């Protein structure tokens, strides 16, 4: 994407580093951030034998889809609505990560302005 | 891959058998109408190989490509992989153009 062009062909000092992000406190600029809520208990994901990479904040929708899949067998075309619920939840999770990348970039942009203006 | 690749080889075997063990595409041609069922399978196998939407090949190859350009990955590997996908459509077109289309280039005893 353009972000690579800015970091590699441009100035990487104001570009998030995907490996080390975030480099700012969570609460900087955010008076009272809500803590992310988890619906599915650890025991429930354990008993559903979800793959560890699947045990994220959307796991409660996955559990419903897998249960529907089993109960609707052999109709492998049912559970479409449950699959979408899980797919949409993962889309919202991905959007959040996109925002975290934009917040990190905008702070690194600010941190340079607040250094250039102070420098002069 | 097992499905359309085994089909493609059986289609080439059908052509090779019918032309007295001829294997060079430069000596095929004009088989689109002469071998209708082999032609259909060859086109279906070629379209599946190139990721034609909703054929068997599309359900693996397409997900692989969009999982590879959204990953944290070597940029040369990603770019080389994308060019190879383009090359896949080129040699596929070679078989259909030279084996099925145009005028027959095989010996006179049909």
């Amino acid at each position: 994407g353009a972000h690579l062009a800015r970091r590699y062909l441009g100035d990487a000092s104001v570009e998030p580093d995907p490996l080390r992000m975030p480099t700012f406190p969570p609460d900087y600029g955010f008076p009272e951030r809500k803590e992310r809520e988890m619906v599915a208990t650890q025991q429930e994901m354990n008993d559903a034998q979800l793959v560890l990479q699947q045990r994220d904040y959307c796991a409660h929708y996955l559990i419903r889809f897998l249960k529907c899949k089993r109960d609707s067998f052999p109709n492998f075309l049912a559970c479409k609505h449950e699959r979408h619920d899980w797919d949409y939840c993962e889309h919202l999770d991905y959007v959040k990560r996109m925002k975290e990348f934009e917040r990190e970039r905008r702070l690194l942009q600010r941190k340079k302005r607040r250094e250039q203006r102070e420098a002069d | 891959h097992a499905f359309f690749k085994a089909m493609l080889f059986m289609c080439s075997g059908s052509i090779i058998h019918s032309l007295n063990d001829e294997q060079d595409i430069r000596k095929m041609g004009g088989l689109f109408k002469a071998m209708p069922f082999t032609t259909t399978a060859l086109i279906v196998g070629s379209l599946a190989l190139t990721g034609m939407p909703f054929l068997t090949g599309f359900y693996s190859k397409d997900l692989i490509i969009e999982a590879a350009n959204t990953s944290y990955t070597n940029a040369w590997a990603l770019l080389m992989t994308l060019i190879a996908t383009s090359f896949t459509a080129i040699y596929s077109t070679r078989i259909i153009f030279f084996a099925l289309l145009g005028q027959p280039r095989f010996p006179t005893l049909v």
């Binding site: - | 004009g30 689109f32 109408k33 002469a34 032609t39 099925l100 289309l101 005028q103 027959p104 280039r105």
Partner: protein
């Protein structure tokens, strides 16, 4: 069982790309003496072959008609 070969007098380059070759050779003062040996490849059922676009669209006419008929059935099946 003798295989009766077709009469050789029926192979003629007229009306085939071989006739074009002869004209481009005639300009330079040459002739193609084997043109009639190639003519069978441009005649009969080997004349006129699909293009590459046409090859891909084999069966598209009936497949589309079935597709049109199918969505009509599905659509009305939901409405009623």
């Amino acid at each position: 069982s003798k295989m009766e070969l077709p009469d050789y007098k029926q192979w003629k380059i007229e009306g085939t790309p071989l006739e074009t070759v002869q004209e481009k050779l005639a300009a330079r003062g040459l002739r193609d003496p084997w043109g009639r040996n190639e003519a069978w490849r441009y005649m009969g059922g080997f004349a006129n072959n699909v293009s590459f676009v046409g090859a891909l669209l084999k069966g598209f006419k009936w497949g589309f008609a079935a597709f049109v008929v199918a969505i009509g059935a599905e659509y009305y099946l939901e409405s009623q």
